Design a protein around this ligand. Structure first.
Ligand code: HEC
Ligand code: HEC
Lengths: 104, 104
């Protein structure tokens, strides 16, 4: 596989939720440094779904090839994002902006 | 609600998958212009899930307040993102980059 091309894919498709650097922060998704040879659900400090915690496989080329084809088929129950807004005041402010912008 | 604050929320939490401008493109999510007073699942040209197509409610302040609190509770079956990589060669290139970056 080509590292240059895979870097570009990573930046375009993965970096919004994941870092890969050593010492890198958790974002929407876990930091992935040391993933290879690690079991699912093991980045220290990250709260996974029970599905991702329990899948029990070891990450490596072959299992990433299958997972990446369709994460939710490979780990049914996995959740990639929470798209909502829990705070009442943020919801009200966002709704007021949407009422303006989606009408003008 | 405060339009200024809601604009900032939109940019930080929604704009990665949605546009709101008239004439705006579909991205991961549908363009939202003309949402208010429209039924779910109606942006022209966008392929929704059957869940979002069938929910059958009208979008307005009160229904957005509930949806935004937790989209998947309000529309069980909804899907916000496909995080995978369907092409074999992209997967191989991405895996090769991850093998390098997550180890160095
Ligand atoms: C935000 C919308 C995400 C995008 C885009 C991608 N990933 Fe992700 N990933 C995300 C979360 C929230 C989680 C944990 C899910 C859960 O059910 O707990 C994950 C998980 C992974 C994993 C497994 C990690 C582990 O077991 O420790 C991998 C290997 C992974 N994600 C890789 C990955 C790649 C390479 C992406 C680009 C194609 C990508 N993800 C997108 C959030 C998000
Ligand atoms: C990408 C990860 C998304 C983020 C972040 C947000 N939304 Fe979204 N939204 C997304 C998709 C793919 C879809 C269609 C889902 C389906 O099951 O088909 C939606 C849907 C909506 C809707 C309903 C639109 C309609 O019925 O026509 C609304 C009102 C909506 N999204 C609003 C919205 C807001 C305000 C967000 C910021 C808080 C937001 N979404 C995040 C994808 C994504």
């Amino acid at each position: 596989g080509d590292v240059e091309k895979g870097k570009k894919i990573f930046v375009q498709k993965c970096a919004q939720c994941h870092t890969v650097e050593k010492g890198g922060k958790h974002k929407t998704g876990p930091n992935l440094h040391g993933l290879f040879g690690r079991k699912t659900g093991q980045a220290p400090g990250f709260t996974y779904t029970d599905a991702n915690k329990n899948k029990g496989i070891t990450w490596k080329e072959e299992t990433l090839m299958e997972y990446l084809e369709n994460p939710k088929k490979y780990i049914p129950g996995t959740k990639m994002i929470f798209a909502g807004i829990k705070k009442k005041t943020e919801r009200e402010d966002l709704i007021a902006y949407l009422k303006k912008a989606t009408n003008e």
